[PDB]
Amino acid sequence: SMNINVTQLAQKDVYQSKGLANDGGFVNAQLNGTADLTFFSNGKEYTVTVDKNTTYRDLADKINEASGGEIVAKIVNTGEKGTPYRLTLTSKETGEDSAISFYAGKKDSNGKYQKDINAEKIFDDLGWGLDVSASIDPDKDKKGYGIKDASLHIQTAQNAEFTLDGIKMFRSSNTVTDLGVGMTLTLNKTGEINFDVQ
Amino acid sequence: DASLHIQTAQNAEFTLDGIKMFRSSNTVTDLGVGMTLTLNKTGEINFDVQ
Amino acid sequence: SMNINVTQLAQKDVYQSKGLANDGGFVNAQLNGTADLTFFSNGKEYTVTVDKNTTYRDLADKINEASGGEIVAKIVNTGEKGTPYRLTLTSKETGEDSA
Amino acid sequence: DASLHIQTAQNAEFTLDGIKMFRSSNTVTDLGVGMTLTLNKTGEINFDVQ
Amino acid sequence: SMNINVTQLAQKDVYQSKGLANDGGFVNAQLNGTADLTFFSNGKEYTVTV
Amino acid sequence: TEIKTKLLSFQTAVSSLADATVFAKRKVVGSISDNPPASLTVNSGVALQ
Amino acid sequence: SSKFEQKVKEDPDSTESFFSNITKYEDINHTGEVIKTGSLSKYLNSNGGNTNGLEFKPGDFTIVFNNQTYDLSKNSDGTNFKLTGKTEEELLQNLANH
User: Fold this and answer.
1) Which chains border B (3 or more CB–CB pairs < 8 Å)?
2) Residue C14 burial (10 A CB sphere; 0-12, 13-18, 19+)
């Protein structure tokens, strides 16, 4: 038997764009051969190529393809008067490991980036307005810019946490895996509770 | 002359992860592509779909 | 997985009107560009166009067109310089958008 | 003194999420009529619209 | 019949220590021979050489 | 006799559904007219909550 | 059932049309029983314009449609009109014209 408390939950970062007219529009209204967009989540790099048939939705789909599900999407028709739309994205990584970051740059023959500021200003178009705290040639950096807005912060990156009767522990996931001989547990609120196995 | 309108009725809009939604009437079928949600009166909800 | 929250209290109306007109309401006229008057319901519409069709009743009738009468009331029918009706009303439906 | 009127029959009352009003005699009806509440017995309830 | 209030958490002597880069980290690998330690807990005395 | 009763009973359901009893009204419980224990009432055009 | 929802949201009226169709009132049959020329012609505006009048208590003569009060204050032919119009024949002919 034991006493418990929980005082974090490992929810993810989820970010959104501004109110776009629609994502059927193109990453920008018109393009060169390519524009290139980069994302990161917990140190992994994710890069996409834009083309002259790439709608904003195609960009969301490519992000999933380029990330292979490492960064996940959920999109919005806000239904707001006149401007019913938003575009949002989600991380695979969660907990204290959750964060996402944002950048634009094209890869080269060294497997290395080149900074596409033209594609960087596409991010503010996509409302994930880059948090400028990144002087980065991302291969070494792996932290892109964040974003600028909190209301656009669909969900936040943070750790999971709990006590056990005198002891406090933080955990990258809401799933507690091996509490004992064949045990598993979930976190559902930040609160105290007591338990018994008997 | 809202004085003839001695008292006024009101509605309920809804909020979302990060977001809050302006409306002309209560409806959240505009989650996205067909996903339909409805607003009760007062509460929060955390979600999982299974 | 997600969070949604909903916290907004609906309210009710209390009301006494101006009166519905008798058979005379002359007021105004038009301009060179077509003068148009219109009455709404949060996205739909109820309309009349003014060439000289510019009586109080033309307007009041469309106000009835928009308001729809989904209301409760108690009745007085006396008159006011050509205005046989006056009532005290209170809401049967809801909404702020519905103002 | 007021005590000679036994326990002093008075209003019938309720509460609606920060909204209230007083009526007892023969009726409790005029609570902003059109959508109204009426009282005869102790109760607690919730509803939702379809 | 009886009524109960309870005002005081029965607790244990619960310790948790410095953060370790290594549980396999050596408490001591070349102790200068041995040390001699003593403890009392649970109303019981303890003695050890380390 | 039994089957005719079945058709009579089925006939009633057919009769029941002939009526568009369902109406274009918002939906909530409680409509008594006089001396019920208690009731709060709302009607057929409300914004739903 | 998704079809049931479809048809109602598509069109409740046709959807009701399958069970029933519509509310039916009594046939609207009633007569203006007695009128003839020269009954009120000069309280009526036989002057051609609008110079003549007739006595009334408000709501002595009115239409109600959709439970809303309806109008009796213009020619259907578009000429000079009043509630106590030009003549007996004109007033009642205009309404049918209306």
Assistant:
1) A, C, D, F
2) middle
